Amino acid sequence: GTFQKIPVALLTTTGRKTGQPRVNPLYFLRDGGRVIVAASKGGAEKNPMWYLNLKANPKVQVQIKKEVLDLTARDATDEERAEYWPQLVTMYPSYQDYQSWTDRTIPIVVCEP
Secondary structure, three states, rough: OOOOOOOOOOEEEEOOOOOOEEEEEEEEEEEEEEEHHHHHHHOOOOOHHHHHHHOOOEEEEEEEOOEEEEEEEEEEHHHHHHHHHHHHHHHHHHHOOOOOHHHHOOOEEEEOO
């Protein structure tokens, strides 16, 4: 393994159009039994499909290493974004090179048991 390794969580959501499962690797934080997941970049012309899927069906699966969790996903509240965003930037310093508005558009999703 190289200095370039970036831990990711595989988030599986239910496709909003077909109901088929869809997987996306995302950046994440653990907080007790919560897993916080976020897109790796922002300011997109479109929200990512995994985020639109979990808006329609909050029931998701998160895999970290070989551990599989069934969780229910919801947007971080304003307070939770303020709480988690600095820990995300610490864990993934590539976020530092984004401007303000870019950051405010990143989905930050709390998945809980």
